[model samples]
Target: MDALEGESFALSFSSASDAEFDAVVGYLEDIIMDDEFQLLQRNFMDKYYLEFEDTEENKLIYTPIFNEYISLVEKYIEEQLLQRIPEFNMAAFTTTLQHHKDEVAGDIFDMLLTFTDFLAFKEMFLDYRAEKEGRG
Candidate 1:
């Protein structure tokens, strides 16, 4: 799919059923295991970790840094899709990082360290779903 198409495809996860969500999580596990995605993760850490400060009040610094990293991933995915597909619409792929912000902000560094782990991703999504359903 093109970038716009890929974005539309990804957005389908927002309303996915539990089974579909689990399948999507499994798909994401494979995606993150790719060497290309590993490089992306490394580069993301290098870029964001430079801006991250370890201190008693780290939450303040960590939240924005993590937010920026999330934004970076979103852009990277869109750009990669665009390059391969050539029919991507930039605006159609735009999405905000608005899920589990508070929980993530609380333990930002730990979360960042495990950002690419499948189990972590699974928990994050499951928590997001629970929160969305008012069960969190």
Candidate 2:
């Protein structure tokens, strides 16, 4: 699989049928609209959990910041997956992360740290999955 970079980074493939791509997009969109993703977004906007630089320019600061997004997603999986799937396992979720990390490397977003670091982590995780799958 290849990724195209435009306004935002996204997984790209030359041969994907519109329906195939839509399926993936639809699933992700569903996940994004879920309560878990909403709470995660709220968590990302909270500055109290983040630090800021004292300079006149007021630089944004984040420590133990990047991992929070990961944790939130994981927490969501744990909390929301139960009714959806009776045999849910946290280890399975982590395994998927490792797989994604292996399969998607540069396709992932690393340069996003300046504005929103969380997206950067997502990109990296995709890259990580790509690499793990030996795609790149």
Best by lDDT: 1
Predicted candidate 1 versus true structure: per-residue lDDT over 1-136, tens digit per residue: 5554233345444523234434333444555567998897767655554454334564665567656656777566556555545764545322111232332233532344344443564354455445656873
lDDT per residue for candidate 2 within 53-104, as digits (tens), equals: 2235633344455456446554654565455546655464444434444443
Worst 10 residues of 1 by lDDT: 92-101
Name model 2 segments beyond 4 Å from true.
1-29, 52-73, 100-136
Task: Report every candidate's CA lDDT.
Answer: 0.49, 0.46
Residue 89's C-alpha lDDT in candidate 1? 51
> Which candidate should be chosen as best, given TM-score against the real structure?
1
Query: What TM-score would you give candidate 1 relative to the actual structure?
Result: 0.38
Model 2, C-alpha of 55: deviation from truth (Å):
10
